[PDB]
Amino acid sequence: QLAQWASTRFRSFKRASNTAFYFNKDPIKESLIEMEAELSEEAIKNFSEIMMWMGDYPIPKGQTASLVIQSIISRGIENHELRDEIYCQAYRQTNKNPKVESAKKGFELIYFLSITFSPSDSLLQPFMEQLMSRNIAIQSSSPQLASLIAVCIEKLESHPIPSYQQRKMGPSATEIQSFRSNLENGDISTCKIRFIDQSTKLAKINTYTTIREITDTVCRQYGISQQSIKMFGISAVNETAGISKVVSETDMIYDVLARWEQSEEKGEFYFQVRRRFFLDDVNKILDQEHLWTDDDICFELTYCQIRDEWMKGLYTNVNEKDSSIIAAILIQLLYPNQSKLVLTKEVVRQVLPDQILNSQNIKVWISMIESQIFELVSQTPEYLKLMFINLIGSKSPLFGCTLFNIQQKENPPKAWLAINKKGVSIFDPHTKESKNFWTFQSISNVAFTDDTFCIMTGNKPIKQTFTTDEHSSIASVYQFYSSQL
SS (H, E, C) the chain: CHHHHHCCCEHHHHCCCCHHHCCCCCCCCCCCECCCHHHHHHHHHHHHHHHHHHCCCCCCCCCCHHHHHHHHHHHHHHCHHHHHHHHHHHHHCCCCCCCHHHHHHHHHHHHHHHCCCCCCHHHHHHHHHHHHHHHHHHCCCCHHHHHHHHHHHHHHHCCCCCHHHCCCCCCCHHHHHHHHHHHHCCCCCEEEEECCCCCEEEEECCCCCEHHHHHHHHHHHHCCCCCCHHHEEEEEEECCCCEEEEECCCCEHHHHHHHHHCCCCCCCEEEEEEECCCCCCHHHHHHCCHHHHCCHHHHHHHHHHHHHHHHCCCCCCCCHHHHHHHHHHHHHHHCCCCCCCCCCHHHHCCCCCHHHHCCCCHHHHHHHHHCCCHHHHCCCHHHHHHHHHHHHHHHCCCCCCEEEEEECCCCCCEEEEEECCCEEEEECCCCCCEEEEEECCCCCEEEECCCEEEEECCCCCCEEEEECCCHHHHHHHHHHHHCCC
Torsion angles phi and psi, residue 479, rounded to 5: -60, -50
Instruction: Measure the CA–CA gap between 326 and 343, rounded to whole angstroms.
Output: 14
Peptide bond preceding 459: is omega within 30 degrees of 0, i.e. cis? yes
CB 253 within 8 A of CB 259: no
**438 bridge partner residues:** 424
Instruction: Measure the CA–CA gap between 148 and 134, rounded to whole angstroms.
Output: 11
Nearest to 269 by CA among 233, 253, 245: 245
Question: Sign of the C-alpha dihedral, residues 419, 420, 423, 426?
Answer: negative
Question: Sign of the C-alpha dihedral, residues 30, 31, 33, 35?
Answer: negative
Q: Which long-range contacts (CB under 8 A, 24 or more apart) does 280-287 make?
A: 282/389, 282/390, 282/393, 282/394, 282/399, 282/400, 283/390, 283/393, 283/394, 285/386, 285/389, 285/390, 285/393, 286/386, 286/387, 286/390
CB 83 within 8 A of CB 117: yes
Experimental method: X-ray
Instruction: Measure the CA–CA gap between 438 and 481, rounded to whole angstroms.
Output: 13
CA distances from 169 to 113, 261, 265 (A): 11, 11, 19
Instruction: Measure the CA–CA gap between 146 and 91, rounded to whole angstroms.
Output: 14
Instruction: Measure the CA–CA gap between 424 and 401, rounded to whole angstroms.
Output: 9
Angle at 177 between CA 172 and CA 182, to 5 degrees: 125
CB 393 within 8 A of CB 400: yes
CA distances from 84 to 40, 43, 67, 110, 280 (A): 12, 11, 21, 12, 53
- Cα torsion 353, 355, 326, 404 to 10°: value is -90
Instruction: Measure the CA–CA gap between 157 and 269, rounded to whole angstroms.
Output: 35
**Sheet containing 269-275: which strands, arranged edge to edge?**
200-204, 190-194, 269-275, 232-238, 243-247
What residues contact 338, with CB distance under 8 A and at least 6 apart? none
CA 242 from chain centre, in angstroms, equals: 16
Q: How many CB atoms lie within 10 A of CB 22?
A: 12
Angle at 86 between CA 81 and CA 92, to 5 degrees: 140
CB 250 within 8 A of CB 212: yes
- Cα torsion 305, 311, 314, 316 to 10°: value is 140
- Cα torsion 239, 243, 244, 248 to 10°: value is -130
**436 bridge partner residues:** 426
- Residue 96: CA atoms inside 13 Å, Cβ hemisphere, count? 8
Instruction: Measure the CA–CA gap between 478 and 47, rounded to whole angstroms.
Output: 42
Backbone dihedral region of 233: left (phi > 0), alpha (psi from -120 to 50 degrees) or beta? beta
Instruction: Measure the CA–CA gap between 251 and 123, rounded to whole angstroms.
Output: 30
What is the crossing angle of helices 100-114 and 143-157, to 10°?
20
Mark 83-101 as b/e (b = at least 16 C-beta within 10 Å).
Answer: bbbbbbbbbbbbeebeeee
What residues contact 55, with CB distance under 8 A and at least 6 apart? 99, 101, 102, 105
State the burial class of residue 339 (Cβ atoms within 10 Å of its Cβ: 0-12, 13-18, 19+). exposed
**Sheet containing 423-427: which strands, arranged edge to edge?**
434-439, 423-427, 414-419, 402-407, 463-467, 452-456, 445-448
Question: Sign of the C-alpha dihedral, residues 92, 94, 96, 101?
Answer: positive
Instruction: Measure the CA–CA gap between 50 and 68, rounded to whole angstroms.
Output: 8
Torsion angles phi and psi, residue 217, rounded to 5: -65, -55
State the burial class of residue 162 (Cβ atoms within 10 Å of its Cβ: 0-12, 13-18, 19+). exposed
Nearest to 173 by CA among 54, 64, 61: 64
User: Can you give the resolution of this entry in Å?
Assistant: 2.7
Instruction: Measure the CA–CA gap between 273 and 301, rounded to whole angstroms.
Output: 10
What residues contact 469, with CB distance under 8 A and at least 6 apart? 450, 451
Instruction: Measure the CA–CA gap between 402 and 422, rounded to whole angstroms.
Output: 12
What residues contact 183, with CB distance under 8 A and at least 6 apart? 144, 147, 148, 151
Torsion angles phi and psi, residue 36, rounded to 5: -55, 135
Angle at 427 between CA 446 and CA 355, to 5 degrees: 155
269-275 and 232-238: which strand pairing? Answer: antiparallel
State the burial class of residue 464 (Cβ atoms within 10 Å of its Cβ: 0-12, 13-18, 19+). middle
Instruction: Measure the CA–CA gap between 141 and 64, rounded to whole angstroms.
Output: 32
CA 442 from chain centre, in angstroms, equals: 30
CA distances from 482 to 398, 423, 436, 445 (A): 18, 7, 18, 11
As a whole number of angstroms, the longest Cα–Cα distance in the chain is 102
> What structural domains and CATH numbers belong to the chain?
1-185 (1.25.40.530), 190-275 (3.10.20.90), 402-483 (2.30.29.30)
**190 bridge partner residues:** 204
